[PDB]
Amino acid sequence: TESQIPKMYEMIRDQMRTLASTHKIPLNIDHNCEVIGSIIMAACTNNRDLRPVDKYWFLMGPAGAEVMTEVEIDIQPQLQWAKGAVHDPKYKGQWYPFLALLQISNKTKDTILWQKYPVTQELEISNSLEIYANGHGIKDRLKNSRPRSVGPLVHLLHLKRLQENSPAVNGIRKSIVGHLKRQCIGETQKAMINQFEMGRWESLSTFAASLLAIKPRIENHFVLTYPLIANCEDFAGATLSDEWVFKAMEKISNKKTLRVCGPDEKWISFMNQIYIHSVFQTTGEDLGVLEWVFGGRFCQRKEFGRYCKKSQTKVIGLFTFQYEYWSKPLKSAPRSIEISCRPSFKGKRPSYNNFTSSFYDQVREECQKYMDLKVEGTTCFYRKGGHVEVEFPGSAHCNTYLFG
Amino acid sequence: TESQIPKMYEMIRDQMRTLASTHKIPLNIDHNCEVIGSIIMAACTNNRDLRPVDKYWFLMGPAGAEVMTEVEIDIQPQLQWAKGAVHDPKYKGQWYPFLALLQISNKTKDTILWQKYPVTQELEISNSLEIYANGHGIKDRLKNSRPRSVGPLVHLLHLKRLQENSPAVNGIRKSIVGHLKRQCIGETQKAMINQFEMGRWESLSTFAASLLAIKPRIENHFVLTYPLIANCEDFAGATLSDEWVFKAMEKISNKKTLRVCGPDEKWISFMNQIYIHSVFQTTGEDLGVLEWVFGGRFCQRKEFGRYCKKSQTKVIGLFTFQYEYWSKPLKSAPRSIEISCRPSFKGKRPSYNNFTSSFYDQVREECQKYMDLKVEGTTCFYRKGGHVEVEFPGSAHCNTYLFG
């Protein structure tokens, strides 16, 4: 799984820099890298969406004199590589999952800046529970490639689309339901997901309430974003389950070669925290946890007004970061609810004893059981510089979230 | 389009004065300006409806001695500019979008004086919901120019007309249906607007019931009327999204040079409020909102009888106006309906909880989402003299309208 990650990141960075440097697009602005990387990812999987030559919003200017304008680029050299890597045997079939992870990681900043809740609204559930709707808008090939990374609400949204309206339909539905059951480890949650499978959305609001109470399994992987990938000069130990990502992106931040854009310079901390969220998928993480891990407060979306249009986004400052603790990406569910003798032997022996002596109701019982869980996570934290086990004790911004 | 607005008022105003000055028509009578402007706006889009020379009811008389008579006017000098401005590159194609804004606002007075409900009656719905039936009687070219300003009911009527009237049908209806969906932000409304697409008008009464609950998005633009345009001598900072319009037409009120016409002098307060109602598109706005915004009580149409004939509309007094607050135009719907953690990070952290644990019904479920809403607007109102955020606190005339 992690064997092809280093060369994957290396060639991603190579194309990242090549497409920008072909037309003198500076890579020290966040918007330039974000747009170019979005074009590259469009080339990666949905090859028919982007254009071989097209104009996009970029920052043209030397030494801080960048102004918004549209620059034509020749994506065909990158298109050829993207289409040729689709079924290259060198990836051992991990090209599609890697691209799914890349798209899921890189489709976050626009959603954060333009606060929208499409999956929950289409599912007619609580909008604040989009926190379980990761992986929306990804390619169907990618969604089957990393369905575990695709959040439970996105899979349930696909199932709802199937119900609202051929063995391919059966295969898609069974994959969706299996991944729903895998992500939602709740037994009552699983049974009511099965109810959704045949179609019973009276528990859909109950599904939202459970997700709020019982937290489904969310698989994750540490994948950097376009600006940091373009600014990353080390990929020797590029794996997905260690501190290599943390150390590399900390070094990138210490380089201080990347500038972020926003409506006004007050958004500098907001963009730094957005970078942190995008790198570590911690958009839904508790703000106290993030403040303790990265040694800095995380500004909520409420602290800032509407994000200005991408046309009028302007450079607002250098990207900065610090952290003191790390951890592996979460594999299983963050919340987990996981004296007598049996003689098979006719002969008399002395005896020895250690001991002297509705469906919605079950769903709410599981909800309260996961309320009884005061600990979150599976194994431990790890301190910066190694894999020494650490545990977060508590913070002022505990129980608070970016959109909470 | 705001940047090009300043040039666009001036050339509208140029032909306003020339038509009246040709036959010595005084411009200090609203009835003279109301008809002359209706002729001027007629040449803008409906070029073949008006006549090159024709007689209309005006007030002829020097210094307050105006007696009503039909006056022939040389409209041919004013005809050429209107058609030339249709595709003049100076507007860069904004002439139709502006003329749709211009045509809608200038027909408000006649509807108020002769209280009729053409859209709701043809839609066989409640007549109290003409607030959402804006944009009726406008040219289809203008209706395709600013369909957003044209209320959904008129589009719904056009949708009903299109079903009760060819590849051109789809093109017109998709704009009709799309702007029905755009204006009515109701998710259940959109599905039941989609029911109206092929003629399932069983929810048409439900739509009226929904309209009482969900207020569809009605885009507003601070467009001036005929008497004020001729009496406005400043257009340098003409913008449709600031207080320039509010400050500009207050100076006209300070001049006290414009006279209003009506059956009798009791309408002087009513006619003054008609100017307030028409300019800011607040005919259906809460009278509690209006009395607070403009610092004056608004007389309802019930306080006055039938309007006198257009052949007997006599001058009743001078136009006066005052205001203390304003707001950015209502771009979205006045009523809008826009807690957990996703740990993507394997660290062992304390679990935190911000909590403890028919299709007509869905429309009614969405209906209750908008009865519960009390605050009206997009962000807030603003005080006179700037864009300082001032929230509407309430008044005695809340939940009361001009026709309420």
Side-chain angles (χ1 to χ4, degrees), chain A residues 1 3-47 49-79 81-404, chain B residues 1 3-47 49-79 81-404:
Chain A
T1 62
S3 66
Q4 305 313 111
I5 297 303
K7 63 153 58 176
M8 271 165 158
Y9 287 169
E10 287 154 5
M11 71 205 168
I12 289 295
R13 173 205 50 186
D14 292 346
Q15 303 291 325
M16 201 45 247
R17 301 166 145 189
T18 297
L19 175 63
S21 49
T22 298
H23 320 84
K24 307 301 204 314
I25 291 183
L27 286 171
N28 45 0
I29 296 94
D30 73 335
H31 181 96
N32 293 324
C33 298
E34 286 151 20
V35 178
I36 290 286
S38 70
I39 299 147
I40 298 289
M41 186 66 204
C44 288
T45 47
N46 50 3
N47 313 140
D49 281 336
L50 74 165
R51 285 205 38 143
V53 290
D54 206 339
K55 295 178 70 176
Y56 312 81
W57 287 103
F58 302 115
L59 278 298
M60 295 298 102
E66 301 94 4
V67 65
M68 280 285 188
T69 188
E70 289 179 352
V71 190
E72 64 182 1
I73 48 172
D74 195 18
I75 304 94
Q76 320 169 67
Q78 294 80 25
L79 286 167
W81 161 87
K83 64 93 176 179
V86 170
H87 296 315
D88 207 323
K90 69 159 74 192
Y91 309 120
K92 308 172 180 66
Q94 308 159 8
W95 182 239
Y96 277 166
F98 164 73
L99 283 185
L101 297 176
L102 198 60
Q103 186 82 269
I104 289 177
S105 176
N106 288 282
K107 287 209 146 186
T108 305
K109 184 179 179 181
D110 286 344
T111 71
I112 292 187
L113 296 168
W114 287 281
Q115 190 175 3
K116 319 294 165 215
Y117 308 105
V119 175
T120 47
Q121 273 293 295
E122 199 170 349
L123 280 165
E124 311 186 318
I125 54 184
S126 178
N127 301 336
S128 296
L129 295 173
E130 197 82 17
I131 207 160
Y132 304 120
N134 196 26
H136 181 257
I138 322 299
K139 196 168 193 290
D140 274 337
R141 302 303 218 75
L142 293 186
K143 287 218 200 73
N144 312 319
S145 311
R146 282 280 179 197
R148 312 162 174 187
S149 288
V150 162
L153 275 183
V154 175
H155 282 307
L156 204 78
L157 186 50
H158 289 289
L159 175 62
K160 179 72 167 301
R161 293 160 179 178
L162 189 146
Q163 301 297 314
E164 279 165 342
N165 58 59
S166 298
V169 166
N170 163 53
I172 295 297
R173 191 208 57 251
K174 67 99 183 176
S175 67
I176 284 165
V177 168
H179 304 116
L180 283 162
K181 292 177 71 68
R182 194 185 181 281
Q183 274 173 316
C184 299
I185 70 162
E187 276 304 287
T188 67
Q189 264 202 338
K190 281 163 196 295
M192 71 156 187
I193 281 171
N194 293 128
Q195 299 316 284
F196 305 143
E197 168 184 12
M198 283 73 74
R200 194 188 76 85
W201 308 96
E202 286 78 3
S203 291
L204 181 44
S205 179
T206 300
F207 186 73
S210 79
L211 291 168
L212 174 63
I214 139 124
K215 291 182 173 170
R217 159 163 38 191
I218 304 299
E219 285 196 356
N220 300 100
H221 288 86
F222 294 153
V223 185
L224 297 172
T225 61
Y226 305 132
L228 298 177
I229 281 181
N231 288 252
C232 191
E233 341 208 46
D234 195 7
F235 294 116
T239 78
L240 297 172
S241 72
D242 55 8
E243 203 195 324
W244 175 92
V245 177
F246 278 78
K247 296 177 287 185
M249 61 66 58
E250 186 191 9
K251 287 214 297 165
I252 298 161
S253 165
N254 294 354
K255 283 194 281 287
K256 296 178 178 66
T257 74
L258 163 70
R259 284 171 288 162
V260 300
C261 287
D264 52 274
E265 287 184 353
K266 289 209 207 275
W267 295 60
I268 178 66
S269 295
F270 196 63
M271 295 296 172
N272 288 310
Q273 296 139 18
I274 278 172
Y275 268 79
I276 299 171
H277 297 137
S278 296
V279 170
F280 310 114
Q281 276 294 289
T282 49
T283 309
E285 192 47 89
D286 194 356
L287 286 199
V289 174
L290 297 193
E291 185 175 348
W292 169 78
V293 163
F294 311 105
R297 202 201 56 92
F298 280 65
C299 319
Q300 314 177 54
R301 188 66 184 99
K302 302 183 294 185
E303 302 174 33
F304 298 85
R306 333 187 183 153
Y307 191 64
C308 80
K309 309 315 143 191
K310 268 192 162 172
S311 64
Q312 65 183 177
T313 57
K314 301 176 292 297
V315 168
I316 51 161
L318 290 168
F319 157 71
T320 189
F321 170 86
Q322 63 187 70
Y323 82 105
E324 326 301 327
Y325 314 93
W326 72 280
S327 184
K328 289 196 188 185
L330 192 71
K331 301 296 186 292
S332 58
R335 290 179 178 176
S336 167
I337 55 171
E338 187 177 40
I339 52 167
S340 179
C341 178
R342 178 69 271 167
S344 301
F345 211 73
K346 213 179 186 187
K348 303 195 306 296
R349 65 221 66 201
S351 179
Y352 299 97
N353 302 319
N354 289 318
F355 66 111
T356 62
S357 162
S358 87
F359 177 67
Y360 186 37
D361 194 5
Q362 319 295 281
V363 177
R364 291 172 80 258
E365 165 162 7
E366 203 166 48
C367 288
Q368 200 58 47
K369 291 286 181 63
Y370 282 75
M371 295 298 102
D372 291 351
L373 298 167
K374 191 65 174 67
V375 60
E376 195 92 8
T378 57
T379 54
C380 47
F381 285 94
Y382 306 109
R383 194 181 297 108
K384 169 182 52 186
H387 67 89
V388 189
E389 317 203 339
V390 191
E391 287 167 15
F392 168 55
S395 177
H397 295 67
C398 279
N399 207 2
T400 68
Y401 321 106
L402 174 58
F403 305 122
Chain B
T1 68
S3 60
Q4 307 281 330
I5 286 306
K7 62 169 62 177
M8 294 177 71
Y9 288 164
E10 299 151 3
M11 293 182 286
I12 291 280
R13 183 197 47 182
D14 283 353
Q15 306 293 336
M16 294 299 291
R17 295 172 179 177
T18 312
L19 186 49
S21 78
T22 312
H23 283 83
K24 305 300 205 314
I25 292 186
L27 285 170
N28 46 1
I29 297 89
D30 66 338
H31 177 92
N32 303 5
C33 297
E34 281 154 18
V35 188
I36 284 282
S38 71
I39 305 148
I40 288 296
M41 185 46 222
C44 296
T45 60
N46 44 299
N47 310 140
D49 280 336
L50 73 165
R51 285 206 36 142
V53 289
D54 205 339
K55 293 177 69 177
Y56 311 82
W57 293 103
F58 305 113
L59 271 296
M60 295 298 102
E66 297 93 5
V67 62
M68 293 177 71
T69 188
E70 289 177 351
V71 192
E72 65 180 0
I73 58 172
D74 196 4
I75 309 163
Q76 320 170 69
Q78 289 76 24
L79 290 171
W81 156 87
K83 63 97 177 178
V86 167
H87 300 317
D88 209 328
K90 51 177 58 179
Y91 318 113
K92 295 159 189 57
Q94 306 173 8
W95 199 235
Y96 292 169
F98 168 74
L99 288 182
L101 299 176
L102 194 57
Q103 187 70 263
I104 290 177
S105 176
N106 289 284
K107 296 206 149 184
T108 302
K109 186 179 180 181
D110 283 344
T111 71
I112 299 183
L113 303 172
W114 287 286
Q115 187 174 1
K116 319 292 165 215
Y117 304 101
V119 176
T120 47
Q121 278 293 295
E122 198 171 350
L123 276 166
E124 311 186 319
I125 56 183
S126 177
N127 300 336
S128 297
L129 297 147
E130 207 76 24
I131 188 168
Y132 318 125
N134 199 26
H136 183 258
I138 318 301
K139 198 166 191 289
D140 274 338
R141 299 292 180 90
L142 296 188
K143 287 218 198 75
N144 308 320
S145 311
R146 291 275 181 192
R148 312 161 175 186
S149 288
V150 165
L153 288 176
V154 178
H155 284 304
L156 204 69
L157 185 46
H158 281 288
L159 173 69
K160 195 173 189 292
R161 285 164 169 162
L162 180 135
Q163 303 157 4
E164 306 178 2
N165 66 336
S166 177
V169 165
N170 172 52
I172 298 297
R173 192 206 58 251
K174 64 96 177 179
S175 68
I176 285 170
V177 168
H179 308 116
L180 276 162
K181 292 175 70 68
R182 188 188 179 281
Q183 281 173 320
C184 302
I185 63 169
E187 267 303 286
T188 66
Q189 259 195 335
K190 291 164 201 296
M192 71 76 88
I193 283 172
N194 290 129
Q195 298 321 285
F196 305 149
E197 194 161 23
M198 71 305 298
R200 200 195 81 84
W201 300 101
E202 281 78 2
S203 293
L204 181 47
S205 178
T206 287
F207 191 80
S210 81
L211 285 170
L212 292 158
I214 149 118
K215 296 184 172 181
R217 157 169 39 190
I218 312 282
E219 287 191 356
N220 303 99
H221 288 265
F222 295 142
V223 178
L224 295 171
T225 61
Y226 305 135
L228 295 173
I229 279 175
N231 288 252
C232 189
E233 342 208 46
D234 195 7
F235 291 118
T239 305
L240 304 174
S241 71
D242 54 7
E243 204 198 325
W244 177 92
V245 178
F246 281 80
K247 296 178 287 185
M249 51 65 78
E250 184 182 4
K251 294 211 294 168
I252 305 166
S253 169
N254 294 353
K255 286 191 282 287
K256 295 178 178 66
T257 73
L258 165 70
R259 285 174 288 166
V260 300
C261 288
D264 58 275
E265 287 185 353
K266 287 212 203 275
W267 300 64
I268 182 64
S269 296
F270 196 71
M271 295 296 172
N272 280 308
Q273 293 144 18
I274 289 171
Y275 278 80
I276 308 170
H277 284 312
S278 298
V279 167
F280 314 109
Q281 279 297 286
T282 57
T283 313
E285 187 66 29
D286 198 356
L287 289 196
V289 170
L290 294 200
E291 188 172 349
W292 168 76
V293 161
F294 309 99
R297 202 204 55 91
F298 284 74
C299 317
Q300 310 176 53
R301 189 59 179 98
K302 302 182 295 185
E303 301 174 33
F304 299 85
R306 67 181 68 187
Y307 191 65
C308 77
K309 306 314 145 190
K310 269 196 162 174
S311 67
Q312 65 182 177
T313 56
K314 300 177 292 297
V315 168
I316 57 160
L318 292 170
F319 157 71
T320 188
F321 164 84
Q322 62 188 71
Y323 84 106
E324 323 301 327
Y325 309 97
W326 70 283
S327 182
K328 280 198 187 184
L330 185 68
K331 296 294 191 292
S332 60
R335 294 178 170 171
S336 169
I337 58 169
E338 187 176 40
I339 53 177
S340 184
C341 177
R342 174 185 62 138
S344 50
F345 183 75
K346 216 177 190 183
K348 270 191 173 180
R349 59 105 182 177
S351 181
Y352 292 102
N353 296 320
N354 266 345
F355 67 99
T356 52
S357 175
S358 87
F359 180 67
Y360 182 35
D361 194 5
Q362 312 293 281
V363 179
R364 286 176 81 257
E365 165 161 6
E366 197 170 50
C367 283
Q368 203 61 48
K369 303 291 178 64
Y370 291 77
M371 301 325 198
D372 291 346
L373 293 168
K374 186 70 173 67
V375 59
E376 294 178 353
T378 50
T379 56
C380 50
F381 292 84
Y382 308 109
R383 197 182 297 111
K384 168 182 52 186
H387 67 88
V388 188
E389 316 200 339
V390 189
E391 161 204 336
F392 163 64
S395 177
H397 292 61
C398 293
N399 208 33
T400 71
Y401 317 111
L402 174 59
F403 305 120

PDB file of all heavy atoms in Angstrom, chain B residues 19-37:
ATOM      1  N   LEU B  19     -38.571  64.845 -24.684  1.00  0.00           N
ATOM      2  CA  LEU B  19     -39.927  64.565 -25.145  1.00  0.00           C
ATOM      3  C   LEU B  19     -40.925  65.564 -24.572  1.00  0.00           C
ATOM      4  O   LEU B  19     -41.820  66.037 -25.282  1.00  0.00           O
ATOM      5  CB  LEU B  19     -40.321  63.136 -24.772  1.00  0.00           C
ATOM      6  CG  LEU B  19     -41.665  62.630 -25.301  1.00  0.00           C
ATOM      7  CD1 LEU B  19     -41.794  62.896 -26.792  1.00  0.00           C
ATOM      8  CD2 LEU B  19     -41.836  61.149 -25.000  1.00  0.00           C
ATOM      9  N   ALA B  20     -40.787  65.896 -23.287  1.00  0.00           N
ATOM     10  CA  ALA B  20     -41.693  66.861 -22.673  1.00  0.00           C
ATOM     11  C   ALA B  20     -41.372  68.285 -23.112  1.00  0.00           C
ATOM     12  O   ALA B  20     -42.281  69.101 -23.302  1.00  0.00           O
ATOM     13  CB  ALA B  20     -41.633  66.741 -21.152  1.00  0.00           C
ATOM     14  N   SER B  21     -40.085  68.603 -23.274  1.00  0.00           N
ATOM     15  CA  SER B  21     -39.701  69.958 -23.659  1.00  0.00           C
ATOM     16  C   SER B  21     -40.095  70.259 -25.101  1.00  0.00           C
ATOM     17  O   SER B  21     -40.199  71.428 -25.491  1.00  0.00           O
ATOM     18  CB  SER B  21     -38.197  70.155 -23.463  1.00  0.00           C
ATOM     19  OG  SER B  21     -37.464  69.564 -24.523  1.00  0.00           O
ATOM     20  N   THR B  22     -40.305  69.217 -25.909  1.00  0.00           N
ATOM     21  CA  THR B  22     -40.679  69.426 -27.304  1.00  0.00           C
ATOM     22  C   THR B  22     -42.029  70.125 -27.419  1.00  0.00           C
ATOM     23  O   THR B  22     -42.206  71.014 -28.259  1.00  0.00           O
ATOM     24  CB  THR B  22     -40.704  68.091 -28.049  1.00  0.00           C
ATOM     25  OG1 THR B  22     -39.501  67.364 -27.771  1.00  0.00           O
ATOM     26  CG2 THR B  22     -40.816  68.319 -29.550  1.00  0.00           C
ATOM     27  N   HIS B  23     -42.991  69.739 -26.581  1.00  0.00           N
ATOM     28  CA  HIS B  23     -44.334  70.306 -26.617  1.00  0.00           C
ATOM     29  C   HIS B  23     -44.669  71.046 -25.325  1.00  0.00           C
ATOM     30  O   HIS B  23     -45.839  71.158 -24.951  1.00  0.00           O
ATOM     31  CB  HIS B  23     -45.370  69.219 -26.902  1.00  0.00           C
ATOM     32  CG  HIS B  23     -45.418  68.802 -28.339  1.00  0.00           C
ATOM     33  ND1 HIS B  23     -44.552  67.874 -28.875  1.00  0.00           N
ATOM     34  CD2 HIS B  23     -46.227  69.190 -29.352  1.00  0.00           C
ATOM     35  CE1 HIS B  23     -44.825  67.708 -30.156  1.00  0.00           C
ATOM     36  NE2 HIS B  23     -45.838  68.493 -30.471  1.00  0.00           N
ATOM     37  N   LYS B  24     -43.643  71.556 -24.639  1.00  0.00           N
ATOM     38  CA  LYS B  24     -43.813  72.381 -23.442  1.00  0.00           C
ATOM     39  C   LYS B  24     -44.633  71.666 -22.370  1.00  0.00           C
ATOM     40  O   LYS B  24     -45.526  72.246 -21.749  1.00  0.00           O
ATOM     41  CB  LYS B  24     -44.438  73.732 -23.792  1.00  0.00           C
ATOM     42  CG  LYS B  24     -43.676  74.513 -24.848  1.00  0.00           C
ATOM     43  CD  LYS B  24     -42.256  74.806 -24.392  1.00  0.00           C
ATOM     44  CE  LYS B  24     -41.694  76.034 -25.090  1.00  0.00           C
ATOM     45  NZ  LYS B  24     -41.959  76.008 -26.555  1.00  0.00           N
ATOM     46  N   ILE B  25     -44.330  70.389 -22.152  1.00  0.00           N
ATOM     47  CA  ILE B  25     -44.966  69.601 -21.100  1.00  0.00           C
ATOM     48  C   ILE B  25     -44.172  69.819 -19.815  1.00  0.00           C
ATOM     49  O   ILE B  25     -42.987  69.450 -19.766  1.00  0.00           O
ATOM     50  CB  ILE B  25     -45.026  68.113 -21.465  1.00  0.00           C
ATOM     51  CG1 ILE B  25     -45.993  67.882 -22.625  1.00  0.00           C
ATOM     52  CG2 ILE B  25     -45.431  67.284 -20.254  1.00  0.00           C
ATOM     53  CD1 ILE B  25     -46.207  66.424 -22.945  1.00  0.00           C
ATOM     54  N   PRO B  26     -44.762  70.415 -18.779  1.00  0.00           N
ATOM     55  CA  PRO B  26     -44.039  70.564 -17.510  1.00  0.00           C
ATOM     56  C   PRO B  26     -43.701  69.208 -16.907  1.00  0.00           C
ATOM     57  O   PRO B  26     -44.490  68.263 -16.972  1.00  0.00           O
ATOM     58  CB  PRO B  26     -45.021  71.348 -16.631  1.00  0.00           C
ATOM     59  CG  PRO B  26     -46.360  71.143 -17.266  1.00  0.00           C
ATOM     60  CD  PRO B  26     -46.101  71.024 -18.732  1.00  0.00           C
ATOM     61  N   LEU B  27     -42.512  69.122 -16.314  1.00  0.00           N
ATOM     62  CA  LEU B  27     -42.020  67.887 -15.718  1.00  0.00           C
ATOM     63  C   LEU B  27     -42.172  67.860 -14.203  1.00  0.00           C
ATOM     64  O   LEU B  27     -41.652  66.945 -13.556  1.00  0.00           O
ATOM     65  CB  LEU B  27     -40.556  67.664 -16.101  1.00  0.00           C
ATOM     66  CG  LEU B  27     -40.308  67.198 -17.537  1.00  0.00           C
ATOM     67  CD1 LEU B  27     -38.827  67.239 -17.866  1.00  0.00           C
ATOM     68  CD2 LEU B  27     -40.865  65.798 -17.737  1.00  0.00           C
ATOM     69  N   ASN B  28     -42.865  68.835 -13.622  1.00  0.00           N
ATOM     70  CA  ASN B  28     -43.127  68.853 -12.191  1.00  0.00           C
ATOM     71  C   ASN B  28     -44.453  68.193 -11.827  1.00  0.00           C
ATOM     72  O   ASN B  28     -44.833  68.201 -10.651  1.00  0.00           O
ATOM     73  CB  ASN B  28     -43.080  70.290 -11.660  1.00  0.00           C
ATOM     74  CG  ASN B  28     -43.847  71.261 -12.531  1.00  0.00           C
ATOM     75  OD1 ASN B  28     -44.437  70.876 -13.536  1.00  0.00           O
ATOM     76  ND2 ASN B  28     -43.837  72.533 -12.150  1.00  0.00           N
ATOM     77  N   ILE B  29     -45.161  67.624 -12.802  1.00  0.00           N
ATOM     78  CA  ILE B  29     -46.346  66.810 -12.552  1.00  0.00           C
ATOM     79  C   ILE B  29     -45.971  65.350 -12.753  1.00  0.00           C
ATOM     80  O   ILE B  29     -45.396  64.986 -13.788  1.00  0.00           O
ATOM     81  CB  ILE B  29     -47.516  67.203 -13.473  1.00  0.00           C
ATOM     82  CG1 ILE B  29     -47.976  68.642 -13.218  1.00  0.00           C
ATOM     83  CG2 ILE B  29     -48.675  66.233 -13.309  1.00  0.00           C
ATOM     84  CD1 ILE B  29     -47.260  69.679 -14.044  1.00  0.00           C
ATOM     85  N   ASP B  30     -46.288  64.511 -11.763  1.00  0.00           N
ATOM     86  CA  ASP B  30     -45.984  63.089 -11.880  1.00  0.00           C
ATOM     87  C   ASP B  30     -46.758  62.450 -13.027  1.00  0.00           C
ATOM     88  O   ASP B  30     -46.209  61.634 -13.775  1.00  0.00           O
ATOM     89  CB  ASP B  30     -46.282  62.371 -10.563  1.00  0.00           C
ATOM     90  CG  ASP B  30     -47.759  62.367 -10.218  1.00  0.00           C
ATOM     91  OD1 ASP B  30     -48.495  63.238 -10.726  1.00  0.00           O
ATOM     92  OD2 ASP B  30     -48.184  61.491  -9.435  1.00  0.00           O
ATOM     93  N   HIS B  31     -48.032  62.818 -13.185  1.00  0.00           N
ATOM     94  CA  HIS B  31     -48.855  62.218 -14.230  1.00  0.00           C
ATOM     95  C   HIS B  31     -48.290  62.516 -15.611  1.00  0.00           C
ATOM     96  O   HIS B  31     -48.340  61.666 -16.508  1.00  0.00           O
ATOM     97  CB  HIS B  31     -50.296  62.712 -14.112  1.00  0.00           C
ATOM     98  CG  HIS B  31     -51.199  62.204 -15.193  1.00  0.00           C
ATOM     99  ND1 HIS B  31     -51.945  61.053 -15.058  1.00  0.00           N
ATOM    100  CD2 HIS B  31     -51.480  62.694 -16.423  1.00  0.00           C
ATOM    101  CE1 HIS B  31     -52.644  60.853 -16.161  1.00  0.00           C
ATOM    102  NE2 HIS B  31     -52.381  61.834 -17.005  1.00  0.00           N
ATOM    103  N   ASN B  32     -47.755  63.724 -15.806  1.00  0.00           N
ATOM    104  CA  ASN B  32     -47.045  64.018 -17.045  1.00  0.00           C
ATOM    105  C   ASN B  32     -45.814  63.132 -17.189  1.00  0.00           C
ATOM    106  O   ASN B  32     -45.561  62.577 -18.263  1.00  0.00           O
ATOM    107  CB  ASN B  32     -46.653  65.494 -17.091  1.00  0.00           C
ATOM    108  CG  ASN B  32     -47.847  66.416 -16.955  1.00  0.00           C
ATOM    109  OD1 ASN B  32     -48.970  65.964 -16.739  1.00  0.00           O
ATOM    110  ND2 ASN B  32     -47.608  67.716 -17.081  1.00  0.00           N
ATOM    111  N   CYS B  33     -45.043  62.979 -16.109  1.00  0.00           N
ATOM    112  CA  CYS B  33     -43.856  62.133 -16.160  1.00  0.00           C
ATOM    113  C   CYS B  33     -44.215  60.654 -16.232  1.00  0.00           C
ATOM    114  O   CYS B  33     -43.501  59.877 -16.875  1.00  0.00           O
ATOM    115  CB  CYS B  33     -42.968  62.401 -14.946  1.00  0.00           C
ATOM    116  SG  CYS B  33     -42.321  64.085 -14.852  1.00  0.00           S
ATOM    117  N   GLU B  34     -45.306  60.247 -15.575  1.00  0.00           N
ATOM    118  CA  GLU B  34     -45.687  58.838 -15.572  1.00  0.00           C
ATOM    119  C   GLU B  34     -45.992  58.341 -16.979  1.00  0.00           C
ATOM    120  O   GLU B  34     -45.568  57.244 -17.362  1.00  0.00           O
ATOM    121  CB  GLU B  34     -46.897  58.623 -14.662  1.00  0.00           C
ATOM    122  CG  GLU B  34     -46.564  58.571 -13.184  1.00  0.00           C
ATOM    123  CD  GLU B  34     -47.737  58.973 -12.315  1.00  0.00           C
ATOM    124  OE1 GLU B  34     -48.882  58.958 -12.813  1.00  0.00           O
ATOM    125  OE2 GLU B  34     -47.512  59.316 -11.136  1.00  0.00           O
ATOM    126  N   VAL B  35     -46.723  59.132 -17.762  1.00  0.00           N
ATOM    127  CA  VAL B  35     -47.085  58.703 -19.106  1.00  0.00           C
ATOM    128  C   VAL B  35     -45.921  58.902 -20.069  1.00  0.00           C
ATOM    129  O   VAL B  35     -45.616  58.021 -20.880  1.00  0.00           O
ATOM    130  CB  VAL B  35     -48.349  59.438 -19.584  1.00  0.00           C
ATOM    131  CG1 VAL B  35     -48.827  58.845 -20.893  1.00  0.00           C
ATOM    132  CG2 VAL B  35     -49.441  59.356 -18.529  1.00  0.00           C
ATOM    133  N   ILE B  36     -45.251  60.058 -19.991  1.00  0.00           N
ATOM    134  CA  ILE B  36     -44.101  60.319 -20.857  1.00  0.00           C
ATOM    135  C   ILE B  36     -43.043  59.242 -20.663  1.00  0.00           C
ATOM    136  O   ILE B  36     -42.475  58.717 -21.629  1.00  0.00           O
ATOM    137  CB  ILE B  36     -43.527  61.722 -20.587  1.00  0.00           C
ATOM    138  CG1 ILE B  36     -44.417  62.802 -21.206  1.00  0.00           C
ATOM    139  CG2 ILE B  36     -42.101  61.835 -21.112  1.00  0.00           C
ATOM    140  CD1 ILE B  36     -44.241  62.969 -22.696  1.00  0.00           C
ATOM    141  N   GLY B  37     -42.769  58.893 -19.406  1.00  0.00           N
ATOM    142  CA  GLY B  37     -41.830  57.818 -19.138  1.00  0.00           C
ATOM    143  C   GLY B  37     -42.310  56.478 -19.657  1.00  0.00           C
ATOM    144  O   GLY B  37     -41.517  55.678 -20.162  1.00  0.00           O
TER     145      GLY B  37
END
